[PDB]
Every structure is written in C-alpha cells, then in structure tokens.
Write a protein that binds this ligand. Structure first.
Ligand SMILES: [Mn+3]
Ligand SMILES: [Mn+3]
Lengths: 1024, 129
C-alpha cells in the first residue's frame, strides 16, 4: 500500500529515535514550556501535507494558529471537526494493520530561541507528554524521529539539530495508524497534541538520567525497612552522589490546589529537618541500600511521606543537578491469597477515572484533576483505576500526597474486534465467568498476533518505567478488554523483570495465567460466589483474590444495590472490593436547539449530537458525577455504602465498628445529634467495635480538624435508629355540618362550609377539590391512577421494553358504577367509584374501587386494586395518583428521606428528618429521566400561600412522592429540552420500581422490583 | 407580516397581518409558471437552521419583500412540471417589487404601485441568534 505511508501501517514501528523511558521528575530549572500558540494546518491525508524537510518558518508563519495543548476536534466553531463517540465498535474498517487512506493529518510548527552559552552548557531534548494518535518530529528541517502511544510520553535528543538563534520545531500528527487498533477505549475519539510540550536543558558533561526507589520491609512485623536508591548517571564529569532523607510529614498534612500544584523552585530550600544522610565515593556505584529504623508507613488512609534530596556532585564539590522528591514506606505483596499492603489485606473503595473535561476533553488542566481527587476524598473513595491509560505524569504526586490506592494501566484496548462477531452471532449477553471463550475467538487478530508483540511490550515498558517511584501505585494493569493472548504473557514477564515490587492486573485474563489477581466486571452475586467457591480449597485457602475492576455502572438514575455488593465485600476475605464505573459523565459542552423552547441553549453532548456515522449514544453519560464533574445522587449513595465506620443504633445502644484498613477512629468526633453533645468513643483499631448505652436516635461521625483536603466538621459516617411510622395528630372534624349533595347526570357535587368536591362520574376525575382555600384536582389523561415513569438509562434495555410492550403508558380508567351516599360517622358524604383500569389492546387490568369519604377538613381515599386477566406484565414502573396543585401552591415540606431523591434500592444515604423544599437544589440529570422521587415518606405538607398546609399521609406504610413542573421527559434529549407546565403537580405513589444497574450489569434485584400484584392503600388529605 | 399566502403591492389586502410559519402554508402552484411566492409588507423574517436556531432579518424603517424557494427556469417552463429545482433553497430579499395589475387584458399596473426608476437606499440587518 503505497498510498498509506509505511510507518502508519507497521505495528513494529513503535517509535524512531525515542529515548528510553525513565522515571518522571518535573524540574523547573530543566523544563521549559513550549505550550502556547503554534502555526497549524490540517490536511486530508499524509500525501497532502508538506515535506517537513522543506518547510520554512517563513511559510508556516502564514498559517492560522492553534493552542498547545488542545484537541483539534475541540476548537472555536468546530473549525477542525467534531468529536466522535464509539464504545466498542471501531470507527474505521478493520483491515489490520492498515489505517484508512483518508487520514486527517495536522502539521504543527513553532520556533524557539537558543543562546551561544546554551548549546555549550546543556543537552537539549524535546519531551511530549501526549499526542494522539502518532507523529513524526522535525527540527530545523531535519527528521528527528517518530512515536506511537497516545497517553504515553516521549523524549528525543535534539542536540545534533539545534542552532544559535531561531530554531524550528515541526510536528506532523496523524489521526489513525496501526496503533488505532490497540487504542479502542470506550471514550471520545480526539486528536492532536493534547498534553504539554517541553524543551529540556540537562547539564551537559554529566546529569541524572534515571532513579529507582524501593522500600522493602526487612521483617514480618513490618518495622525496620531497607531503602534502596539506585541512580543512573550519564557522562564522566562527576565525583559522587549525596542523598538526604528528611523527617516525615504525617499524612494528615493540610493541602489545597495551590500547594499541591506549586512547582517552585531553584533557590527554594526543599527541607532542613534532616534524618539520614549518605554520600557515595569517587569511582563507586551510584547506588546504595540503607537500613531505616521503624519508619512511618505510607498508606492511602494516611499518606505519610519522607521528602528527600538527591544531589549530583562534581570534582569541585559543587551541585551539578538536584532531584527533590519523596519516599513512601510501603510494601505490596500477594500474601495468603490477598493483595496485601504492609501485611494488611486492603479494601478498595474505588472508581475508574478517565481523563475528561467538558470543554477541553482529554487535555485536562491539573487544577481540574485536583478538583476530581478532592471530591473523591470528600466522598470516602480510597482508590482509583486509571481507566484505561496513564494520565499526565504530574498527576501521580497528587495520588502520593492525598492517598489513593492506584491501578496504573497500560494504554491498550482491543474491544472492537468483537463487534462484528457479536452482530454476526446475535450475541445478547456476556457474563464474567464465560465471556472469555467469546474473546478467545478473535484474540489472534491482535493480542495473540506476533506482529503486535513489540507494540504490546512498549505499552508495558512505557507504563512502568515512567511511574515506578510512586508509592500510591500498587498495581500495574496490562490494559483493558483486549482479549487474551501471548502478547499479554510477554507483558507480564517484562513487568515482573522491570519492577518486581508490584502486582499485575488484567481482567481479559480470566484464570490469571499471567496476572497476580482475579478480576470481574459487573458480576452478579451468584457469579462472584461461584468463583469464590471454585477457587477456595477444602482448607479455606485461596491462591489469589477477587476485585471488581468495574461494577455498579453509574449511568443516570442509579446505580441500585451498591448496598448488596458491599455486604458481600465485608463478608469474605476473598473479595477485596471494587472500582465503580465511572467517575464522571463524558459530556462535551455545546449549543443545543431546544425541543421545549425552539431556542438555543447550553447542553452536554453524547453520541449522536456531533452527527457521527456510527456512535453509541448516551453511554457517554455513565458517571457518579455529571459532565461538569459535580456529584449526582449516585456519588451521594456511594459515599454512604462505603463509609469506613459503621454506626448501628438499636435497643438503647450505639454500636460503632471501625471499618478502615489501617487508621484509628481518634481523628473522629462522634456527636449525638438528638442532644448536640459529643460521645466519648474509645480509640478503635481496624475491625474493633464498641457498644455504648444511649437514648440517641441519630449519631454522626465527623472530622475533628482540617486534615488532607478535608475540613473540620466534615461528615465521614453516620447512623440512625429506625423510625416507626407515627400517624400525625390531625383532628378530623366529625361534628355534624349541613352538606348539600348534588348527584347530577355526569357530575357529583358535595358542598359544605369551607368545602367543595366535584367528581366527573364519566371519567372518575376530580374536577376540583377546594378545602379551606386550598385546591387540588386530578392531573388526568385516561386514568386517575397512573403507572408510567420516564425510563431511566437502566430501564431502557429491558424493563422499559416490557412496560411499553404491555402498553403501561396507555392505561385507561373505565368507570362502571358510581355510588353516592350521605355521610355516616362524622362523615359529610361517601362517594364510591367502581371501575376497570386497563390499557388499550389488553385483557389485564385492575378491578378498582375508590372510596372517597368526605369530612369537613379531610378526605379519606381508600383504593382497592384487584389484578385480573390473562397476559400480564411482570412489573410496573410506579403506581399512584397525579394531582394538579392550585395557583396558591408555593412550597412543600416532608418527614422522610432527604434532602435529595430516593428509590427502593438507592435510598440509604438519604437519612430521615424533616425537610423543606426551599433548602434543596433538586438534581438536574444530563440525560432527562425519572428523578425527584422521595421514598419512605411518613407525611407530606403542601403549603399554599395565605391558606396554610395540606397534610398527606398513607395509612400503615410510608409512601412515595414527587412534586414538579416538568413533562416531555421521555423524549427530551438534554436538560434544556424538558418542557414545563404553568402549574405544579403532585405525583402521589403507593409504590415504585427499583433502579438497579441494568444498562450494564444486574437487573433490579427481586426485593426491589414492583411486581404485578393487587394494590390496597389508604390516603388522607388533611386540610389545615 | 402579510399571509398566509403571497402578496403584491396591488394584491395584498386579503393577506392580513400576523405571525406565519412556512410549515402551515401550501404555497400556490400556478398552472402557467410565473412570478409567485412574494410576501409584501414584511416586518421581520426568521430563517430556521437545524441545530443552530434562527437568522432574523429586518429592514430599517420600512417593511420589505421576500421569497424563499427552490425553483428556477420559471420564465421558460410551459407547465408546473417543467419547473426546475436547485439542490438548495435561496432567499430573494427585496427592497421593492413592481405591482401586478391586469394588463394581459385591461389596465396597466396603476401608478402608485409601479416600481418607478429612481435611487434606492435601504438598510438590512442580518441578526444571528
Ligand atoms: Mn437537546
Ligand atoms: Mn410542459
């Protein structure tokens, strides 16, 4: 293929002239930023791009500019195209290893100045932190080299090519290559120089090239440790190295964005609290091993660090070069079948975090990454998986300093090889225990393809060697969803040779033939349990443990049943936790035309919005946080289920259990919320508990002092005693009032002092109910009892299909008889309505009786619903009344769960209390769907201006409710597409279907499904 | 402006003022192809583009004339089916238009409706949402 350049279709051409990967250290004196505006031009294919060996700056000066770093699909006015979202499917034809012939080619150009002294004093390099998909590099019209690996770094020696005065850098960037085949992550396709570019000036005669730091405990009691520091010095003109370790700074250290990101400086004195000092001798190995007496452990719960300074020293005793970094005393092992840190079998409270920003894409400002991690810490997360590639190299100090268990993952995904197979065989489902047999069929294309070994090894080597020295990283991962083949085995051997100190993860390797860990994604409890039992021997020993690298798919309203996963995690030593998918929605900000408005509004794009030929729609929106990286109810729930302290209140006792891996409860203040006075809680070690006699209902665990990125008073954990349903002390007026009852041909009136009740007998509709200045009426379309909800993302694949199939959205009320009688026991009147509630097309439906017992200040509504007929649905979304609220309506207040929404399998984070609608910002989903329900509601007060409240309560059971404004939610593509009525309604529900995680994972669990059955429930509408 | 149908200086009064949508109107097809589809006394015109909102167009201090269509070869098309059509629409945005009269058999367009030869001065705004 001579119409495709050779280097874009050669799997073995991983790079040309790239320097060997070394440990990353930012040094202000060495690094010089080349970020900013670059001359840029985009071409249809390589053959249209100029020969860079002949490109003048005088020519390139005339081009438009683009700012580095940034993706070229994310420019003002979409100048160079729009983002493309695919999940599994490749956006190109599969013809391994050929890219498409039409291959967008971007040529970048800029200049930089070089001194006379500069070329004499320094070795000059160019370092590119990330370029997608690949590029060739030119300096002063001379080819320097080539590079592949979009999320990896690259350094090139530039010394031969540089001149005094102006120097010309030209980068030719290509969108597709043979590399595309191994970069098929479920994310946006975006191109360009999207990470930093630097000019490095290293001291010329001698400099530090690489450093290796390891900490190994000498003992089984993890006290004394060996600190090993090995340095690779390049050049002859040096004497020896010095090394200074400083006194530790405890992990409770206070940080903010400014101090975490501070990059200074040359004359800045790193530290002076010396602890250990070592010097090397002239002509001796530039490495050493030191015994360290009982050092402070580095742990994710307490990220204690020892700062150090490594000095290269010349003959005259002057400092040639300094490295200022840190040491975290930590050892990871596979021990008695568990992932062990410092001897302790840890629990992952994790997320997968992609690089994403709603405007900049994968070109994420560090500022924003910091924001992410602070939020994670604020929500009890202790681990992150780098799905599915290494991040910007500066990010890993953030993990080191804040404390996260990190899985650093190779930039390698092959998923798309399956898509034609899936479609050809009409595959419906993949299961963690059996799906590997399906991937085995196509492994030969890439992961079991010998032509790709060099590429696969390069992804491994690049991953490990850049980040080896970060204590936060405890696991290397071979990539994601790339099938299983010989190349993976090769990667495993290499990684163990390169870095024996860490463990290797790869989910595509079911039996972990070349991994140290077992891993499932989105498994069912039954599947987890099968695996556990088949890998635990008769003695109770297992050889390797199980993590969930992906679980509890956080797409839209959900995920449900995080609770049940967690119970499982705590019950078995074999399970060591999981990482939920995903941290945040991948939405890109754009201008949307509103379906509600006809006008232009800001929105967040998912597949389809940028008009891709092939895309995967709304699967972009699968985070615990929204596109703007702010918490959803998903994140709020997750924080509660993973809380590292359990507080249980029953039988006049508070039981507190420490569920941390390492730290004590000493940092925590326990407050009795009923009294406001604090509770003396003994210092609890991991797994220790205490029972304290108390009359309390509600206990909170809170932070005593600012520590890390958390503030004093920040809530870590809480507990409540279960709250019995109490009937409010409303006094029903049972005194005898004269009441006019008018039973007309169609309409029935009941009028009394301060009361007006009108029912349409033909429809079963309340035309108007006005009691003491407060009015409601039925929000009626076919039925007074409705069943539908705007489908969640989780509803879509199955439950929605069923509910639509059974016409649940077209449920009709057909009145059979209406009975009108004078009031009896204090009653004004009794109106009884007999009807069938059934959808068009169908037999099934409810023989329904609605008894309205009317009092002067109250209306008792008894509902009896008898499920009848053949060919019924399995379940319903919802069941209850819909009422229009009067013009007087202003706000509401409830006793129940809050402040936010709650659903049967997503409710426990929302504690009981009295809540006011005015105190709550109601959550807006990026993708419109079922929202705003409040479950386990004891009573609801609706406030009408100038007329007090209407109190609503269900007899003997708590109920569900939603008060809103909105409609057209089913078909609104974005928040701005949601329509709004001129008045509010109340959705008053007996029951509601759970939420689950079926968009990708298990269906709503049995106990949370709203199964088809008879419904019997009684409501009171009490008017003040 | 005037609608729902077409309007011309001496043939416009049946077309009352209001807000009109092109989607609500079956545009009239003449048995003999000729000048058609003009809208006179137009206050403003909104052109809707998919996924990008509207372009608003208005003439300063006087109402204007406009036609939005598809068609050409109208002069020489003998019948409706002889009318040619471009692959895109155009806007004919007019300061002024000659009246219609009844001169095929009867009086010429009356004086006050004739587009007399004279200087033309007019200002348009192309406002993008
Ligand atoms: Mn929209
Ligand atoms: Mn003809």
């Amino acid at each position: 293929s001579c119409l495709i350049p050779e280097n874009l279709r050669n799997p073995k051409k991983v790079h040309e002239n790239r320097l060997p990967t070394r440990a990353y250290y930012y040094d202000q004196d060495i690094f010089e930023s080349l970020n900013g505006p670059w001359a840029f031009a985009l071409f249809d294919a390589p053959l249209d791009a100029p020969d860079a060996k002949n490109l003048d700056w005088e020519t390139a000066k005339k081009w438009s500019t683009i700012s580095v770093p940034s993706h070229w699909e994310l420019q003002e006015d979409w100048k160079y195209g729009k983002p493309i979202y695919t999940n599994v499917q490749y956006p190109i034809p599969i013809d391994i290893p050929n890219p498409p012939t039409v291959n967008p080619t971007g040529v970048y150009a800029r200049t930089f100045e070089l001194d006379s002294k500069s070329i004499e004093s320094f070795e000059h390099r160019l370092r590119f932190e990330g370029v997608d998909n690949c590029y060739e590099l030119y300096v002063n019209g001379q080819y320097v080299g080539f590079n592949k690996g979009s999320r990896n770094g690259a350094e090139f020696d530039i010394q031969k090519y540089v001149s005094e005065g102006e120097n010309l850098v030209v980068v030719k960037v290509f969108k597709w290559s043979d590399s595309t085949y191994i970069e098929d992550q479920d994310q946006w396709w975006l191109s360009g120089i999207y990470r930093d570019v630097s000019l490095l000036k290293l001291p010329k005669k001698a400099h530090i090239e690489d450093v290796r730091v390891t900490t190994t405990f000498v003992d089984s009691q993890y006290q004394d440790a060996e600190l090993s520091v090995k340095v690779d010095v390049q050049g002859s003109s040096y004497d020896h190295i010095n090394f200074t370790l400083y006194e530790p700074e405890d992990g409770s250290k206070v940080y903010d964005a400014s101090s975490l990101l501070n990059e200074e400086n040359g004359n800045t004195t790193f530290s002076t609290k010396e602890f250990i000092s070592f010097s090397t001798k002239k002509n001796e190995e530039t490495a050493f091993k030191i015994n360290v007496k009982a050092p402070e452990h580095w742990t994710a719960e307490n990220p204690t660090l020892y700062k150090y300074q490594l000095d290269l020293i010349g003959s005259d005793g002057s400092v040639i070069q300094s490295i200022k970094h840190h040491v975290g005393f930590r050892q990871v092992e596979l021990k008695d079948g568990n992932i062990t840190v410092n001897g302790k079998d840890i629990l992952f409270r994790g997320v997968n975090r992609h690089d994403h920003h709603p405007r900049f894409g994968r070109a994420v400002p560090l500022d924003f990454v910091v924001r992410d991690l602070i939020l994670m810490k604020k929500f009890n997360i202790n681990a992150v998986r780098n799905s599915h590639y290494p991040n910007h190299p500066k990010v890993y100090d953030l993990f080191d300093k804040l404390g996260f268990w990190v899985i650093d993952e190779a930039d390698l995904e092959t998923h798309g090889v399956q898509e034609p197979f899936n479609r050809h065989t009409n595959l419906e489902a993949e299961y963690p225990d059996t799906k590997n047999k399906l991937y085995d069929v196509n492994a030969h294309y890439l992961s079991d393809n010998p032509e790709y070994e060099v590429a696969y090894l390069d992804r491994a080597s690049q991953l490990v060697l850049r980040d080896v020295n970060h204590p936060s990283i405890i696991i290397w991962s071979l990539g994601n969803e790339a099938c299983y083949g010989r190349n993976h085995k090769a990667m495993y051997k290499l990684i163990k040779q390169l870095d024996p100190t860490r463990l290797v993860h790869y989910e595509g390797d079911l039996n972990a033939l070349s991994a140290d860990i077992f891993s499932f994604m989105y498994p069912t409890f039954e599947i987890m349990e099968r695996w556990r039992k088949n890998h635990t021997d008769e003695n109770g020993k297992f050889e390797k443990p199980l993590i969930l690298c992906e679980y509890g798919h956080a797409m839209g309203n959900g995920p449900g049943s995080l609770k049940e996963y967690q119970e499982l995690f705590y019950k078995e030593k074999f399970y060591q936790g999981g990482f939920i998918w995903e941290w945040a929605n991948h939405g890109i900000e754009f201008e949307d035309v509103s379906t509600a408005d006809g006008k232009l509004h800001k929105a967040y794009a998912y597949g389809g919005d940028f008009k891709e030929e092939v895309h995967d729609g709304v699967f972009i929106m699968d985070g615990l946080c929204n596109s703007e990286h702010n918490p959803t109810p998903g994140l709020v729930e997750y924080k509660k289920v993973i809380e590292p302290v359990h507080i249980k209140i029953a039988h006049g006792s508070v039981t507190i259990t420490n569920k941390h891996d390492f730290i004590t409860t000493d940092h925590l203040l326990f407050i009795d919320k009923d009294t406001g006075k604090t509770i003396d809680v003994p210092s609890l070690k991991p797994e220790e508990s205490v029972t304290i006699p108390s009359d309390t209902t509600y206990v909170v665990a809170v932070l005593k002092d600012d520590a890390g990125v958390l503030k004093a008073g920040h809530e870590i954990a809480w507990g409540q005693a279960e709250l019995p349903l109490k009937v409010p002390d409303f006094v029903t007026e049972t005194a005898e009032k004269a009441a006019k009852i008018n039973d007309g041909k169609r309409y029935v009136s009941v009028e009394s002092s301060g009361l007006h009740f009108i029912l349409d007998k033909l429809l079963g509709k309340i035309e108007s109910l006005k009691v003491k200045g407060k009015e409601i009426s039925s929000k009626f379309e076919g039925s007074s009892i409705t069943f539908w909800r705007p489908p969640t993302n989780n509803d879509e694949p199955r439950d929605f299909k069923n509910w639509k199939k059974y016409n649940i959205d077209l449920m009709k009320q057909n009145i059979h008889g209406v009975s009108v009688e004078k009031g009896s026991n204090g009653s004004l009147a009794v109106v009884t309505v007999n009807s069938r509630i059934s959808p068009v097309v169908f037999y099934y439906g409810f023989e329904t009786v609605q008894k309205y017992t009317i009092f002067a200040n109250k209306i008792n509504l008894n509902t009896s619903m008898k499920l009848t007929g053949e060919y019924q649905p399995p379940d319903f979304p919802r069941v209850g009344y819909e009422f229009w609220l009067g013009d007087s309506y202003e706000s509401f207040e409830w006793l129940g769960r809050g402040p936010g929404e709650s659903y049967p399998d997503k409710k426990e984070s929302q504690r009981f209390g009295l809540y006011d609608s005015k105190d709550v910002e109601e959550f807006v989903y990026d993708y419109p769907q079922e929202n705003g329900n409040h479950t386990d509601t004891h009573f609801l007060n609706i406030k009408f201006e100038g007329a007090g409240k209407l109190s609503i309560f269900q007899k003997e059971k708590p109920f569900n409710f939603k008060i809103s404004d909105e409609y057209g939610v089913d078909e609104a593509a974005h928040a701005c597409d949601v329509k709004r009525y001129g008045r509010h309604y109340l959705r008053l529900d007996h029951a509601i279907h759970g939420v689950g995680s079926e968009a990708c994972g298990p269906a709503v669990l049995d106990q949370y499904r709203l199964k088809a059955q008879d419904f019997n429930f009684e409501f009171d509408l009490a008017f003040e």
